[PDB]
Symmetry: D2
Subunit: 303 residues, 4 copies
C-alpha cells in the first residue's frame, strides 16, 4: 500500500536570547506529539534552532558565528535524534551550517533528512538565496541571506528515507519551479522544507496582503505539476518585532491542501500519505517520459 | 506606451457541422465588442475554428483533413483580420494547421499572434500533446491529439506584438512550468493561449471535480513565478455531448486573477494591463539574473 | 485548555445491494482508525447506512420503507455504539428515520450526536430539503427528498456533547446562513454534518464545475461568520451511476480549512480542535451582543 | 433591459488635509473612465470624501464635524452628480452624514445610490459598527466608529436604480449574513458598497494575514447564498500611516469573483452584468419560497 503519516511541526517565534536547549525542548514536544498521532516523519522549519538572524547586520563575526552549528548533531541537539529513533519518527531539520574547508569558512542555510532510526540520510543546502548582501537603511528589518550564506553546492538531491523518496527545499526555494522539477525528475514522492517568511516585504510592500497566497500557490503548484506530496513548516508569529507567516501545510500530489495550521505558535498537523497516489499524475497527465520534449527546454539550463 | 487593455474571447461550443463562416461571425462579434470596451488585443481559444475533432477516432484521412487550415488566413477567415486592423485590436487565434512539404503532410495544433494592424507577427505549435495514441473502446470520447498532431517544432518563442512582448501556449502547455519558464527567460510580458478541457477525464476521473482548480492553479502559478500577465481563452460548454471547461481568465503578474468568465457560451472579458507591473516580480523576488543557479537545473534539459 | 481531536469519516459509495451490516463494518473501521489517531469524535455522512435512495422513484412503499431505520440503534448498528463507548470516541450518524405517530408514517432525513460513552445526546431532522416531490423524466437521476422526507420538526438545536457544544446540519442545510446563525446564537462551538452531493445538477448543470467551490464556500463562510469549528462528511464516488462530491473537511472558526479529504472512498481525516479558539471571533469582530441590531432582521423570520 | 456593465472605483489613500475638491477630481476621473468602458453604474468606497478619520481619538467636536457632510450634494460634490447624469452612469457614494434635528446632532456612516440621471434614489446608514467605544492607548491607530456614528435607522432597504434592484452595505456590514439576507429577501439583484479595512487588527492581529481571505469570503458567500451580483469598492493603500486592504471586487450571483483590483491606488474595474443570472440560484437551489422554513429562524430576530 505504501502508506505513512506525514507531520509538520510549525514553530512559534524563537527569541534572540532563546537557547538551543530551550528550542530542542519545543522540538521534542512536537515530535513526540506527532508520533503519538501516528506520524512516521515530521518536517520542521528552516533555521529551526535559532531566531532568524539574517534580519540584522552583524559587525562582530564571533556574534554571527554563534548562530551556526559546527556539529550535527551536537550534544544539545542529540536528544532530538535519540527521541526520533526511540519513537520511530524521522524528521527534516533546518539550521545554519558552518564548516571550514581549505582555509575558507563556509556558511550554508542547511536542512537534513533523518530517518526513523535517527540517522542522517541526506543533506541539502539552500540554492536560492533571497534578500541582499549589504545593509540597507530603508528596510525596517534586513534579510541578509546573501551575506550570511553562499548558494548551496549539493544541487537538488532526492534521498531514500525509510520507504519514501524525499527531496528537500528551503524557504525561498519553494517559489522556483526549477527546484521542484529537478527533484520531480529524480522521482521524489515527497518534497518538504521549512520557511521564515515575513508578512512584510520592504522592496515590494504592495504584495504584503498576498504573502499567504504566494506561499500556498507555490506549494500547491509544485505538488500538482510534479505529482508529489509536499509539506512546508514555517516558523511564524512576531519574532523580534518582525511578523512571520504561518499557514504551514501538507499538500497532496494533486495540489490539494490536506492539512493547514491556523495558529502562529508551535503547532503540529498530520495527514495520511499514500506514496502510490503520485501515480495519478505521474503515469498520466504528467507522465514525463511520454509528454516532455526536453529539446525545447534548453534555455532553462543555460548559464 | 506601457498601458493597454487585454481581452479574452471565450467560445461556446462549435458543432461538428458548424461552418468556419459561422464561427468567424462569432469571433467578429467578440472582437468588435472587446474593441468597443477598450481592448487592443483579444485572446481566442485553441482550435477556435472547428469543433474539437480530436475527440473522435477517424478512419478517413479526407474527413480528418477537413478540420485543418491549408492557408492562414483564407477567404473565410480574412474578415476577422480586416476587422482587427480596422478597429486596432490584435488577437491570438488557435487552429489546426496542415502543411504539405514535398508530398509530406505535417499536422500541428497551432496558434498565431496578430497585431492591431491585422498582420501575423508570430506563430507557435503545441509542444505538449495530452491524451493517448490509439483508440480506447472504454472512453465516452477519445483524445487523440498525439495521433492528429506532431509536437511543435518552433520551441516557445516570444514575439513583439505592437508594444508588448507576448508568448503563446496552447491548452495542455499551461500545466508545464518549462513552457512558462522558457518564455519567462525570453522576457514575455504577456503569456496567452486557449484551451479545450473536458471536465471529465476517462483514465483519471477522480480528478474531475478539480478541473477548474487545476486550470486556474496552472495559470496563477505560471504568471506569478515568471512575473507575467497571462490569459487563457477556453471553448466551453456541451460540445458534441462532451462538457468543456469554462473559467476563461486574465491574470496579473502576481498570479492574481483579475477577470473570469462565468458562462459556458461566447463571452468577452477585459482587464487593464500595465506592462511595467512585471517589474514587481522580475526586478525583485524573481530577479532571474540575481537568484537563479542554472548550473543545477541541467536535468530539466536532458533528453 | 478545552482541546480535543475532531475527525471526519468520509464514505465511498454504498451500493443499493450493500447491507447495513457491511456498511457498519466500514463505519467501525473508520471510527477505530480515528480513535487510534487521537480523535474523540468522528463525523459520518448524511444517510450513512444506505445508498442515496432519493435518486429513484419508488412505486412499492414496502421497498421505500426498507431504507429507513425504525430503531436507533438496532441490533445491526449496535456494534458501532459499543465501539464508540469502548474507545471513547463519539460520532455524528446520519440515517433515514421512520416513525409512526398518531396514525401517520413520519419520515425524516435524520442525524444524531453520540458521546464518548456511546449514548445518544441529541437528534436533528433535516429542515432544508432540496430537490423535488414528483418524478421528473428530464433528470438522469432524481432527487426526491421532498417526496421521501418531511421538513425537520426539531428546529436547530445545540447539544452538550461531552465537553463541547455541538450543532448539527444535514447536507443542503449547510448552504443556508439561517441554520448556521441559529446554532451560532445558541453558542455552538462545533457545527457538523454530512452530505450526498452529486457533482451534476440537472436543473442548473452550468454550475457543475463549481460543486466543490460551493460546498467549501458554504462551510468556510458558516464557520467564520459564527466563529465555529465545522466539519462535513460526504459520501462520495460513483454510487449507482451517480458521481458524488468528496472534499470532506474540517474548518476552523476563522473559516480556514484545516483538513480535507482527497480520495472518493472511505477516508478519515482529523484535526486538533481548541474550543477557546471560537473567542477570537465571538468576543471581537463577531461579538454578537455588541454588534448585532436584531431590530433590523425581522424579515428573515417572517413566515 | 436586463443587461448592464457594473464598475467599481477603488480609491487610493485620501490624506487628512486632502480637500473634497481634490477627491472629487479623483472620483470624476474614475467615473469618466468607467463610462468610457461601458459602465452604467460605478460603486465607490465607504466614506469616500475624506481620510478614514475614525482612526483618531478626537477631543474637539468642531474638528470631528469637519469630516461630515451637512448637505448632499453640496457645491463641491455637485460636479460628480452632473457628470453622472451627463455620461449616463449612476454611482454608490459613501460619506459621513451630519444631521441637525431640533438642535440635536445625528451622525451616520452613510451611502447613497444615484441613478444614471444623476438623481439620488436611495440611502442607507451603516448598521454594523465595528471597533471600540473608548480610546485604547495600546493601539497604533484607533477605530472609534461606535463613538462617531449611530447605528443606521433605515434598515437594509433595496431600491430601484434605473433597471436594477440594488441594495447597499457598508464595510463591516458585508461580514454579516443578516444584512445580505434581508436584501436578498427583498429581491436585490445587486448588493454593493465600499470599505476601509486595515490589514492590521490590534485586538486580534493573529488574523492579519487573513484580511483578504475574510473580505473575499464574505463577498463570495453573500452573493452565492442570495443569488445576487455584488461589488465592493475599497479605499486602499497607506493612508495616514495605516495600511488599508485593496482587492476591490465584482462578484457573480454564483459567488464567483469576476473582476478584482490588483493595485492600492485609484483603480477602475468593470464586469458585464445580466440581472437574469440571479435566477440560476433564486429559482432553484435558493428558491426562498420553496425551501426556507422561517418558523425556525426566530432566534435571529430576537432582540
Ligand atoms: N527564508 C526565506 O527564504 N524567506 C523568503 C522571504 C523573502 C521573499 C522575498 C525577498 C526577501 C525575503 C521566502 O521566499 O519565503
Ligand atoms: N486541449 C487540451 O490540451 N486539453 C487538456 C485536457 C486533458 C488533460 C489530460 C489528458 C487528456 C486531456 C488540457 O491539459 O487542458
Ligand atoms: N443531500 C443533499 O441535500 N444534497 C444537496 C445537493 C442538491 C443541490 C441542489 C438541488 C438538489 C440537490 C446539497 O445541497 O448538498
Ligand atoms: N470600515 C470598516 O467597517 N472596517 C472593518 C474592519 C474592522 C474589523 C474588526 C474590527 C475593527 C475594524 C471591516 O469589517 O471591514
Amino acid at each position: 500500500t505504501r502508506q505513512m503519516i506525514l507531520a509538520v511541526g510549525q514553530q512559534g517565534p524563537i527569541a534572540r536570547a532563546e537557547t538551543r536547549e530551550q528550542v530542542v525542548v519545543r522540538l521534542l514536544d512536537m515530535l513526540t506529539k506527532a508520533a503519538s498521532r501516528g506520524a512516521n516523519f515530521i518536517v520542521f522549519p528552516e533555521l529551526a534552532l535559532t531566531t532568524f538572524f539574517p534580519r540584522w547586520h552583524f559587525t562582530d563575526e564571533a556574534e554571527l558565528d554563534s548562530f551556526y552549528e559546527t556539529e550535527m548533531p551536537g550534544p544539545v541537539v542529540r536528544p532530538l535524534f535519540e527521541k526520533a529513533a526511540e519513537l520511530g519518527i524521522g524528521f527534516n531539520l533546518g539550521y545554519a551550517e558552518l564548516v571550514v574547508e581549505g582555509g575558507v569558512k563556509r556558511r550554508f542555510n542547511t536542512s537534513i533528512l533523518v530517518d526513523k532510526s535517527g540517522k542522517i540520510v541526506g543533506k541539502y543546502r539552500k540554492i536560492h538565496l533571497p534578500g541582499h548582501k549589504e545593509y540597507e537603511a530603508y528596510r525596517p528589518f534586513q534579510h541578509l541571506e546573501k551575506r550570511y550564506f553562499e548558494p548551496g553546492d549539493l544541487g537538488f538531491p532526492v534521498y531514500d528515507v525509510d520507504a519514501a523518496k524525499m527531496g528537500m527545499f528551503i524557504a525561498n526555494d519553494r517559489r522556483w519551479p526549477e527546484a521542484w522539477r529537478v527533484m520531480g525528475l529524480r522521482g521524489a514522492e515527497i518534497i518538504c522544507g521549512g520557511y521564515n517568511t515575513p508578512t512584510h516585504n520592504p522592496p515590494v510592500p504592495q504584495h504584503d496582503h498576498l504573502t499567504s497566497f504566494h506561499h500556498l500557490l507555490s506549494m500547491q503548484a509544485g505538488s500538482y505539476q510534479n505529482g508529489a506530496w509536499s509539506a512546508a513548516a514555517g516558523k511564524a508569529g512576531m519574532e523580534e518585532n518582525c511578523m512571520l507567516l504561518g499557514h504551514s501545510c501538507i499538500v497532496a500530489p494533486t495540489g490539494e491542501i490536506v492539512a493547514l495550521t491556523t495558529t502562529l505558535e508551535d503547532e503540529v498537523i498530520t495527514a495520511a500519505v499514500d506514496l502510490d497516489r503520485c501515480r495519478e499524475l505521474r503515469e498520466h497527465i504528467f507522465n514525463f517520459k511520454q509528454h516532455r520534449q526536453p529539446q525545447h527546454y534548453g534555455l532553462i539550463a543555460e548559464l
